[PDB]
């Protein structure tokens, strides 16, 4: 039935505000105080149903810089009131491996792992330059901030100075009138349409799209004293919560419909995206339910979570052993969907009467992981272990998979775009639907295979036979030809490979002798590269955490003269596993 809950020990949160996110690649992020806490995605062939073996939780210390550092607080005033910088909200990119953090001082900074990339900044004012929310572009690689002017500033990327990402200001939109300083307090960005909200709870929407179009924005709700609790967007339908209300707004046709909640204690919306049925899950500390988003809102109960939750919460009635001899409530510190949206993670806590504070470090939580449906799929919205997690959370059910797909059936249905330049050709394959399914399934089976991929590789090389004049490239395609039990080009050299301190030469023959190892001229046998099938002479490898296949780290290889084919591979798969598409770990 359900995965065993994950202990998060001796952390604390600044507020009851939703501090949980679940990143594409399967990582959990909690915005705890004073550091972010991370649930590192881990692979174990078996977990006795303990989500402990899916995420190992760790402190994720970061180095926030204050762009406003030397700036005297102004219209806000509460600005640099707290000098030391710590994280408030955190949202990983839905697209790239990458993540932004709003700090307590209105800075939005972008991070690759821990190294900061660029701290978003622009124009002037200060009012203009201090932020209260940010959203990632769900379609391409950009980001939006909201500032204290009631304005949205947009940032695009490349710029580069050699392959280092780097953001820059791109455009803005004013939302409130000039003679006013309500701030932007919410931005949800979905597909082709963007919706934001202001301090005065007025709400706006636009189409940011063909960018040359200076995007026309339209107010979809008057200013109101009713503070917007949570704002999201379900297939071109905007959903707000309130104190005691839920409002829905059809962008599709421009019409509002809203329902009371009784609870009057603010609470969050979880969209149930795989419904073909415009459905959501309102959920609070106290209770929770389904709401269909037809013209009429409809409450059906199920909740598919509350069954599980109140089961756990009733069991805890021994630590208060039945009766009101104390006073208990379930506390939610965060909720987040799977990147693929098939599971749910809930950070929660359960306590009692009048409390006895209990210092900082001392205090634990639980993360519950639960499936939202009866079946799932390998979504493009998750990668690597994130898929594996869904697999596990769905009790080891294989995902759907197209009819007549089989694991040894050709990439792109055999129809290989060999006319492309090598690097486009590899992207082409990586994006392919088959590669994805194969990658995930490799996490399921005893012996990860990449044959369907290797064949595509081979058909590419062969096409350019007169251009395989590099011996590493040679040794490489020779090796591939062998695995594929397929006609190789002939050849007659040896190969010489190095590491910092030593060399081993190899006869081009001996690349066909064995799929796993190659043996040298001096009779020392080494393991193979696994992207390249080349010899491994060096500590400096990366390792795929599922297959344990070891890949040559080209970024640490000054010594060896890799040819177009062989290098183009090692560059391209320097960080991602071809076997399961999880990210490779420096060993």
């Amino acid at each position: 039935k359900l995965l065993k809950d994950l202990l998060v020990d001796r952390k604390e949160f600044e507020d009851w505000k939703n501090n949980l996110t679940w990143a594409r690649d399967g990582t959990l992020y909690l915005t705890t105080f004073p550091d972010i806490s991370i649930g590192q995605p881990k692979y174990a062939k078996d977990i006795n149903c303990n989500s402990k073996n899916l995420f190992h939780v760790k402190e994720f210390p970061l180095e926030f810089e204050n762009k406003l550092d030397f700036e005297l607080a102004q219209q806000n005033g509460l600005l640099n009131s707290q000098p030391v910088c710590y994280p408030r909200v955190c949202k990983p990119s839905p697209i790239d491996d990458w993540m932004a953090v709003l700090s307590n001082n209105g800075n939005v900074s972008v991070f690759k792992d821990n190294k900061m990339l660029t701290n978003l900044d622009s124009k002037g004012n200060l009012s203009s330059r201090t932020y209260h929310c940010f959203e990632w572009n769900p379609i391409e690689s950009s980001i939006v901030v909201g500032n204290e002017d009631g304005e949205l500033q947009f940032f695009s990327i490349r710029k580069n100075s050699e392959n280092t990402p780097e953001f820059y200001f791109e455009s803005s939109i004013r939302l409130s009138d000039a003679g006013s300083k309500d701030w932007v307090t919410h931005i949800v960005w979905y597909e082709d349409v963007l919706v934001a909200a202001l301090s005065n709870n007025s709400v706006f929407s636009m189409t940011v799209s063909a960018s040359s179009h200076q995007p026309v924005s339209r107010m979809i709700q008057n200013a109101s004293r009713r503070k917007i609790t949570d704002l999201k967007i379900v297939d071109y339908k905007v959903v707000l919560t309130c104190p005691g209300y839920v409002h829905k707004i059809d962008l599709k046709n421009y019409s509002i419909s809203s329902l009371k909640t009784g609870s009057l204690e603010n609470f969050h919306i979880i969209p149930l995206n795989h419904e073909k049925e415009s459905t959501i899950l309102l959920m609070s500390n106290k209770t929770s339910y389904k709401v269909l988003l037809e013209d009429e809102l409809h409450v059906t109960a199920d909740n598919i979570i509350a069954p599980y939750l109140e089961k756990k919460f009733k069991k805890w009635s021994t630590i208060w052993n039945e009766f009101n001899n104390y006073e208990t409530t379930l506390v939610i510190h965060g909720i987040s969907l799977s990147p693929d949206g098939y599971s749910i993670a809930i950070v929660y806590d359960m306590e009692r009467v009048a409390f006895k504070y209990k210092i900082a470090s001392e205090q634990s939580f639980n993360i519950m992981f639960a499936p939202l449906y009866h079946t799932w799929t390998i979504s493009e919205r998750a990668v690597g272990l994130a898929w594996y997690q869904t697999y596990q959370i769905y009790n080891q059910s294989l995902p759907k998979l197209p009819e007549n797909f089989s694991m040894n059936k050709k990439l792109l249905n055999g129809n290989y775009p060999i006319s492309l330049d090598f690097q486009s050709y590899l992207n082409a394959l990586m994006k392919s639907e088959e590669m994805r399914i194969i990658m995930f399934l490799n996490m399921t089976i005893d012996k990860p295979s990449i044959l369907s991929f290797l064949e595509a590789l081979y058909e590419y090389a062969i096409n350019k036979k007169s251009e395989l004049t590099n011996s590493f490239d040679l040794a490489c395609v020779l090796s591939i030809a062998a695995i594929l039990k397929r006609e190789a080009p002939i050849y007659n050299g040896t190969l010489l490979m190095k590491n910092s301190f030593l060399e081993e030469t190899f006869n081009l023959e001996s690349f066909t002798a064995d799929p796993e190892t190659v043996t040298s001229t001096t009779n020392n046998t080494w393991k193979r590269c696994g992207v390249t099938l080349l010899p491994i002479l060096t500590t400096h490898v990366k390792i795929c955490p599922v297959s344990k296949q070891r890949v040559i780290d080209i970024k640490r290889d000054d010594l060896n003269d890799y040819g177009w084919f062989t290098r183009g591979l090692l560059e391209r798969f320097n960080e991602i596993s071809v076997y399961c598409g999880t990210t490779l770990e420096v060993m």
């Binding site: 507020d15 509460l78 600005l79 009131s81 408030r88 004293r225 503070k227 204690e265 603010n266 504070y357």
Partner: protein
């Protein structure tokens, strides 16, 4: 002297800084006492920062038409097997004079010694006064002012008409509620219209903040009314309100027994504009930090020990921790508007001020020996009254290094019970700092007329009032 400390703490803005120029200069002399001249409108140093619940004059928008309060059965004997507050006479000792006051009596200073001080000690039904409150006012009350006194025994509210320049006064109304203990007592000030007094606000131990019209012209000097239905009762089912401050003439902030803070609209109650959790439990006090130059901001301390300042526009992004205490049962907090700072105690025995725009610049003010029980500040002057659990009122000037940036402060009174005699002593006696006694609340009159008046009660029921000087 203090040139870019003041810039560091308050920002630029040639205006606000000039307000601060007037404060530094006006009261920089005033170690323990300020010249009366500096409070008058025509003074070149006059700085007066009204609270949010003026500036609009509410009334018609809030108490409007048929929300009005209710009836009045005097009978006194009615009042008495209903709020049993007496029998006894408390034995007193002022300076060296033995007196024997029963309830409803007072001792007046101008017939005491030299008879030079102005002011009295009054014996409210003692015991004790929950909170009291001088309702700032000048609008057909030449030198006449009203001050409310909340008292518990089911428990009630007394109302005093008083002269500013002689500190005479009468008890004008005794309103019996059954709201139990009542605190954060304060007058709206946006309530007026004719047909007597102003209108009055408080949280009750029933968990609701309620407002009531105080009304009764002198066709009967002293009445006994029975408030039976408040004009307005902000409430939230399953939560209980523990503290409230005004945000505008038409909105309030409040905290709850559960850690939540809400914003309520007096034109439209019941449905709170927001309701979010801020603390772990019982919120002991919440105060508003109004400034003509920054977004108004709210502070909040609880039994959890924490003390935050946030902006209601969006708490989530503004929540700022000033400090965390060893979690008192009482941590009283007020906003002292001339320095834009909150004045609060920790748990124990030290006053601190923290500017609302500079949470990092905590200045300790005083710290002595006994859990500080209450504190009073003003719109007119930067002086802080502060009453401890040892029964002692302390005055002191904010303008610490708060407008000084390179000393501290004196006691005006000290109550004392007997070690068997039944003799309560007050000590006029000067002394500078480098049960059935203590102090439950102390507040300034805050009008240009009686700006130098203040009141302070102790749990014993002895409410004393003075006009400040050099004895």
């Amino acid at each position: 002297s203090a040139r870019d400390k003041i810039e560091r703490i308050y920002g630029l803005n040639k205006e606000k800084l000039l307000l601060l120029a007037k404060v530094k200069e006006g009261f920089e002399t005033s170690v323990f006492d300020f010249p009366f001249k500096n409070i008058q409108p025509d003074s070149p140093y006059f700085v007066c920062l009204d609270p949010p619940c003026k500036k609009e004059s509410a009334y018609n928008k809030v108490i409007g038409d048929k929300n009005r309060t209710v009836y009045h059965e005097i009978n006194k004997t009615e009042f008495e097997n209903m709020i049993k507050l007496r029998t006894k006479r408390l034995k007193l000792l002022i300076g060296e004079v033995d007196a024997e006051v029963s309830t409803g009596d007072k001792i007046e200073f101008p017939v005491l010694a030299n008879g030079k001080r102005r002011g009295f000690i009054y014996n409210v039904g003692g015991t004790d006064i929950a909170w009291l409150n001088i309702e700032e006012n000048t609008d057909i009350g030449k030198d006449i002012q009203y001050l409310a006194v909340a008292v518990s025994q089911s428990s009630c509210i007394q109302i005093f008409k008083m002269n500013t320049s002689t500190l005479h006064c009468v008890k004008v109304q005794t309103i019996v509620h059954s709201f139990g203990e009542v605190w954060d007592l304060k007058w709206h000030e946006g309530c007026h219209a004719p047909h007597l007094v102003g209108c009055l606000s408080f949280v009750s131990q029933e968990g609701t903040i309620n407002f009531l019209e105080i009304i009764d012209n002198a066709t009967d000097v002293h009445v006994f009314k029975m408030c039976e239905k408040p004009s307005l009762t902000l409430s939230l089912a399953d939560s209980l309100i523990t503290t409230f401050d005004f945000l505008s003439p038409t909105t309030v902030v409040c905290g709850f027994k559960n850690g939540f803070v809400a914003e309520f609209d007096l034109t439209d109650p019941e449905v709170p504009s927001f309701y979010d959790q801020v603390h772990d439990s019982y919120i002991l006090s919440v105060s508003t930090a109004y400034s003509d130059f920054e977004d108004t901001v709210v502070s909040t301390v609880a039994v959890d020990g924490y003390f935050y300042i946030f902006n209601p526009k969006d708490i989530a992004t503004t929540k700022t921790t000033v400090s965390r205490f060893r979690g008192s049962n009482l941590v009283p907090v007020v906003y002292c508007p001339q320095i834009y700072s909150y004045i609060y105690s920790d748990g124990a025995s030290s006053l601190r001020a923290v500017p609302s725009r500079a949470a990092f610049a905590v200045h300790p003010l005083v710290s002595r020996e006994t859990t500080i029980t209450a504190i009073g500040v003003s719109r007119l002057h930067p002086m802080v009254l502060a009453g401890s659990a040892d029964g002692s009122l302390i005055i002191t000037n904010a303008a610490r290094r708060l407008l000084h940036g390179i000393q501290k402060s004196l006691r005006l009174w000290k109550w004392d019970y007997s070690i068997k005699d039944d003799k309560y002593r007050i000590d006029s006696s000067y002394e500078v700092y480098p049960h059935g006694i203590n102090i439950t609340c102390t507040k300034w009159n805050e009008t240009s007329a009686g700006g130098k008046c203040y009141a302070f009660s102790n749990s014993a029921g002895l409410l004393t009032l003075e006009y400040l000087s050099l004895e």
